[PDB]
Design a protein around this nucleic acid. Sequence first.
DNA 1: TTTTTTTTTTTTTTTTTTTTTTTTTT
DNA 2: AAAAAAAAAAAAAAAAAAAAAAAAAA
DNA 3: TTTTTTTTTTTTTTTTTTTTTTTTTT
DNA 4: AAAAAAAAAAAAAAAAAAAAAAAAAA
Lengths: 93, 105, 105, 105, 93, 105, 93, 93, 93, 93, 74, 74, 74, 74, 74, 74, 74, 74, 74, 74
Amino acid sequence: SYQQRLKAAVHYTVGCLCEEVALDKAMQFSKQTIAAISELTFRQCENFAKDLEMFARHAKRTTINTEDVKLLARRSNSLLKYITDKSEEIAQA
Amino acid sequence: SYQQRLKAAVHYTVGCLCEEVALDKAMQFSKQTIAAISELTFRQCENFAKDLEMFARHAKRTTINTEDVKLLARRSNSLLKYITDKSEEIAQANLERKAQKKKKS
Amino acid sequence: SYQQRLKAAVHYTVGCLCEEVALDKAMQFSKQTIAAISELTFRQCENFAKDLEMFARHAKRTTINTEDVKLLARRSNSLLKYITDKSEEIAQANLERKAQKKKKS
Amino acid sequence: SYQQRLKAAVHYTVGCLCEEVALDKAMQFSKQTIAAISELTFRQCENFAKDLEMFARHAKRTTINTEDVKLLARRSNSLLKYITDKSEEIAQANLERKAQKKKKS
Amino acid sequence: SYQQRLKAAVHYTVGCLCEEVALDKAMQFSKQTIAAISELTFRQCENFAKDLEMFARHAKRTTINTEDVKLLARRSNSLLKYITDKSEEIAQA
Amino acid sequence: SYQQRLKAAVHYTVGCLCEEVALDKAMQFSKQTIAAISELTFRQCENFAKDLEMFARHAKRTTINTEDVKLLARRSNSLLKYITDKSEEIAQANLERKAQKKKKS
Amino acid sequence: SYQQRLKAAVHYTVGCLCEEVALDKAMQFSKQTIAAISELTFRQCENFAKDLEMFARHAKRTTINTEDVKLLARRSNSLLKYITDKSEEIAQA
Amino acid sequence: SYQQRLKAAVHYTVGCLCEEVALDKAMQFSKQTIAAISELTFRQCENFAKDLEMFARHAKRTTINTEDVKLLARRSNSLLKYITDKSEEIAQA
Amino acid sequence: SYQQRLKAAVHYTVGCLCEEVALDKAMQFSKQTIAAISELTFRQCENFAKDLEMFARHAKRTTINTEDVKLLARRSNSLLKYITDKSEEIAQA
Amino acid sequence: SYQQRLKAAVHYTVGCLCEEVALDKAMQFSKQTIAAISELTFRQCENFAKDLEMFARHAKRTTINTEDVKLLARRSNSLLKYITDKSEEIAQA
Amino acid sequence: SGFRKELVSRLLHLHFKDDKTKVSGDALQLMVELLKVFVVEAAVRGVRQAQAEDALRVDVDQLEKVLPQLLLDF
Amino acid sequence: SGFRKELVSRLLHLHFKDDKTKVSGDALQLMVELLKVFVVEAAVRGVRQAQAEDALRVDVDQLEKVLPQLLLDF
Amino acid sequence: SGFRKELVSRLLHLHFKDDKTKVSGDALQLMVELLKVFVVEAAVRGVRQAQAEDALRVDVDQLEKVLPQLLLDF
Amino acid sequence: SGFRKELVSRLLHLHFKDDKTKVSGDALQLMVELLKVFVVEAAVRGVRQAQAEDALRVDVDQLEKVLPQLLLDF
Amino acid sequence: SGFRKELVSRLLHLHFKDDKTKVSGDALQLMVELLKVFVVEAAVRGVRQAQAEDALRVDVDQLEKVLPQLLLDF
Amino acid sequence: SGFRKELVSRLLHLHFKDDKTKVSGDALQLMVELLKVFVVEAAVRGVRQAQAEDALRVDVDQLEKVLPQLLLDF
Amino acid sequence: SGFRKELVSRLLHLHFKDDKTKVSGDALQLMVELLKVFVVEAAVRGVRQAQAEDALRVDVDQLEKVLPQLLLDF
Amino acid sequence: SGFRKELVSRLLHLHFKDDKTKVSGDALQLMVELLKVFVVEAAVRGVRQAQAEDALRVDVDQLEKVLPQLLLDF
Amino acid sequence: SGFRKELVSRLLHLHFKDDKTKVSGDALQLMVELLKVFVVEAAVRGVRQAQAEDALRVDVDQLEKVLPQLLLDF
Amino acid sequence: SGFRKELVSRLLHLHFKDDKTKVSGDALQLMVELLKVFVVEAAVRGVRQAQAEDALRVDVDQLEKVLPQLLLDF
DNA sequence: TTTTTTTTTTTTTTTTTTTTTTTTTT
DNA sequence: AAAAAAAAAAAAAAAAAAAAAAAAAA
DNA sequence: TTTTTTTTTTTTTTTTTTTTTTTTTT
DNA sequence: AAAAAAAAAAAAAAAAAAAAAAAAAA
């Protein structure tokens, strides 16, 4: 099935970033831990996407913008600042 | 502080309505569970306040209505279904306003 | 007195707009700066209103309309271009007045 | 430029004025002050001239006379009474204008 | 004569003022210096009376005021800054 | 600098006109008595000049005429009379101005 | 005194004559040179006075004529030559 | 020259007298001084000769006597008194 | 030619120090004093060099040092005084 | 003083040689002359002795001998000639 | 039976980023219902746990086993 | 961010010496624009003056330097 | 002591939209007087402000403190 | 090293309940950043926990203890 | 310490050609100040000249050296 | 016989405090005369003094003896 | 340029033993000439002596060299 | 005004008896000094001779009556 | 002690311009005396000046200072 | 004929800065010869100068005219 | 009494003249 | 050293605009 | 057909009333 | 804990002024 095939590419990229963390602390990660990240990533995106749906749908609209996204991770405040900053970088375009 | 005051108020009604469920189920709750649900709803209210802000901000208005709210309990679908029923009863409490102020003949 | 209370009502809206410009230029205002632009606006409406008076008296009327006002900010070219354009959008609120007013057929 | 020649001649006149005032108060006038009043006065003249024009053409005349001038000086009352006083002596000086031409019989 | 008396009365207080200087510096004068300054003061008062007359006659009233006066101490500017100071105090009378 | 060169040309004419006096008496001048009069001449110009400025600002004109000058010649009486004499003579030098400027009748 | 004031007037004249000669070569005269010539010429006039009187008396006149002058200055030949010339210009005046 | 060795015999007679002066006060003259007096008298003999001839011509004579000579020594009167005496010493012969 | 220029190069430098001297005494230099002071410096450089040599080779060295030159200012006391002063000053530099 | 005392004893012997020169040419000395050579010898002995000290020390010694003395008279040629003869005559002593 | 109108209002006026933010009569009325089901289900989930591991009273162990899923539905 | 009809209305009726002076519907909506532009221009020129002398916050002395220029513009 | 007539007149003619506009002799004299009182007002006002906030120097800051009312006055 | 522009795109388009939704490029480029913050803070919390209860390596147990916290943030 | 005030008055009156000349009370007071400064300058200048030549008192020689500059100052 | 016109002019313009001070023709002419008689009088007085004290030339000492009266007359 | 008759007249009346002696105008004019030539020759001779011995000015030393000759010639 | 060090070296090297001879840095600087003292003294004494016989500048006669003693000291 | 007769005679007959002139013997004996006394007082006065400025001998300067005096007397 | 042995010896020891300096008897006999010729040539040329310029005894001007030349030779 | 046009008179502005002051040249 | 130009201000006459008296109507 | 006045009819602004939200007192 | 006032804003109806239709003249 289509959805299974993309979970494998997800595991790949989840594998990507976990390694930068492994050199940061000079220490070792379990592979089942790498496996559990791709599962919740994919589980999590379900809620993110369907949430974003209600948000965009609520916006008198059909397609995602920057405001729907910045609504979605309002919960941890280290994150809020992080992302507004990153948004001025991507806004160069 | 003022907020210690309002925090403990939350606890009071949580104590009561949770007693409704303790009755119903033949199982009694620890006081920390009680104390926990109170502080939890309080945490929840920051998220309620924030989210409702960005909803009313998003609709070019400052007096919030039912739709921003029905959208706040959006997440579990048992709840959004529950909410609509109860919002329709609100429409029936609305009919009560038309009886209150009487019209022409 | 009644005057300084109007001074304080003016202070509100100017505080709003000072923060909106603080958002665009990524640099905020001193609380004392907010106070000084309000003092400015209040004493500006002195020359506005009494300039508006001799205009309505210059055009030999009692009631001030759009022509006097357009001539009151006659002084800078960016500003003058700006006012006339928004005169067409305000006239769109009169087109809503076209939707409102009874036309017989 | 030609306007800069006349701005320099204006500095002369303000200088004379401030010289006389400096000896009245027994305290000297700063370099900046004399310069700033010279530029103040030239700036002020823009608003004088345009309002004068608005008044002349409003009062159906091509040549601005004494009425339009006194219209322009309307604003502070110590200033307005000054004007009319001195106007009598100059009007008396005009009696001298009538007198310089010889009379018939 | 009556004017020779005025030269001598100029001398009498010129006798007293140069002694403040004798207290001050520890340099006293010959009585010939005292006599020559008194003669000078009277001779000089002729030009100052004439001078003040020229000024007051030019300002066209018949009494001399403070203006004409402070203008007669014109030549040294140490004198002039000093002169204006003391006018402030006599005007407070 | 600027002033000292004017002083030196001054020194020249003094040498000359002091020779006219040496002429008159068959008695000789120290070159140094010459120098004394020159410097003195310069510092006297200072006082002549200072005084003629205070005259002219206080008569509301910016070009000095003969009257200020003859007020400056007040001190010994032989001076005052002698100067007046010579003023009417050179006034005739400028009457020449009128004779030579073509007069058409 | 006679001699002294009249010597100061003669010294002035002599001072003038020396300045004339100084001008010619741009070679100037000392203070002492001028003075010595002034006194020499003053005492030279004592020889002139006595001699003129003896020669006037000597030709039985009291009033001194052109002949006496030329008699007295017979001394340097270029001079008697040139002074006879100037007596012609004098005989014209 | 006639003048030259005769200036040499003048130079001689005067040299006699200058040495007799070197005896009296016990101190002498410079070489140029000896020369300068010999020259000086020679030039002085010009003055003597002219004037003497004009005195002898005043008195209707060519043959020169006592009177012209003592009138030539008219100048300093210390001299005039000294020489009238020696003229009596000579009047003896 | 080469030594004619060295006499003339010595001429310019000697002339600067000699015009230094014109200021101080209130008296100037004729061409001849200047020209005769320059000839001497050039001709004096001979016996200085050959005495410096006799001193340098006489001490078993190929190069003259500080001691041969101070030895060259030997028979006057004041040259000792002034030049040792200058030797301690140039030892600073 | 000891200086003055030696001066008057030297004056004796210089007056000797000067008097003996008065014998030979029948030519007498001014007495200022006799003192100028006595004074000259005294301060010349500063010149002679300071240099003699300098010489003796330069040739390995403190005691001045024949060698240094013969070198001090090497300036005019009649002096050099004079000295060598008398050295062989007194070397016999 | 349940939450008091004004109570909830001032509780939401606790966490507003703009205090000009309003709540209308109906909206507030339904806030109560939200929180009704909110804690309804907090209590209900806690007891399904106490029974599922067969408890004699409901202690914090069970409650804290029912916290995760409640947060995700809200 | 839109300015208020009522606000401008009562503000204007302050300095009238004749009360018969009314403000027409469009004249009222246009003074909304004039004051808006005036405040935006007073605020924008304050920031441009604080920018000019490199201030790290917008303070009193910057507005005072553009006070001359603002009087003449309005 | 007031402005010279030539000066005032050429400065006025600098700003006529219609150059057909003249300045009458008496109007010119009024303006001589008027510019005197205006400048005297500015200097007088400035001096009072400096001395009111107790300065040895009348600074531009004090003149700027009297600007609001000065310009409302003229 | 890490999230492809395309990855996040595909992933989102998979679970859109309305297919009308496309994602603007910048919004796409922000999610690589959001997914970046998401996974690595889950990873950081696994390690902080391995360290806290005194351990040799990062295992399932420690992560499931920090699971509550991660849900709360996202 | 100083000059008799009636002295000053009468001295001046002798020298007026038209005695219609009067001197104000305040100008009289300034005159006593002027007389002070006049005489004291004569005196203090005489002293500085004597100082300069190491004189034991102020002699007429030094006074007359200070007359020139005093005359320039008045 | 006296001073050059532009010489005397330049001298006096060296000390004017107001540079607007300018000098009419007759004023200039009488100034040439005044400077003439001025300096001649300094010379005249000097000669009186040399003669009076029977000096063989006009020296500094006499000059100083004559200065006082010069300045009294001017 | 040269000697006055009046001067010569007073000086020579000072040395006459007979005062009845008066001087003809002609004699007087010729002696204006003699006096002038005498003095100018003294000056010129002074100058020639200074030049001959290469002086920078004509000093008393040179004059003294010219005195003897001048007087034998007169 | 101080002897060129290149000049003194080439002058010294022209007439050295052994060609092994060089001049060290400080020694040649001191020869510059010794030659500089030589010229200065030759000069001071030349001026001293002309004025003694009172010449009106320093000709060969003067300096040369000082050149005898110049070679003895050097 | 003094002048030779034939010497004196020869000298004077060289400058006479008429040769008819014969001189009596006592007049020539007189000339012996007059010339004797000429040189005598020339020398005596030369002597008195050398003494006076305190000269080392009787030398040319002194005499020439009294050459004025001698040729006035002759 | 002349100089004694002791004169010279004592005379030498006067200016010695080191008195360890000894004098041999023959070198002493020789300095007698030297200073003997020293005085003789000082005299001879002083004498020869008085006679060469024709002076009336041996005077100081002549010795000191031979002084530069004599102190050269000594 | 009402309504319209031409000639002369007077007023204010702009340009030019005329005079005064300062620098450069022969 | 002496004379004219260059710059600046002031004043006088020409340009511009209105008001008075004479002409024509309703 | 041309001229002027009064009645009725409609339009736009200002104030006041009436409703809604928030905050405090009893 | 419950109710009402206080504050604000909106909307409603009366005030303000013009333009249409009918009445009398040119």
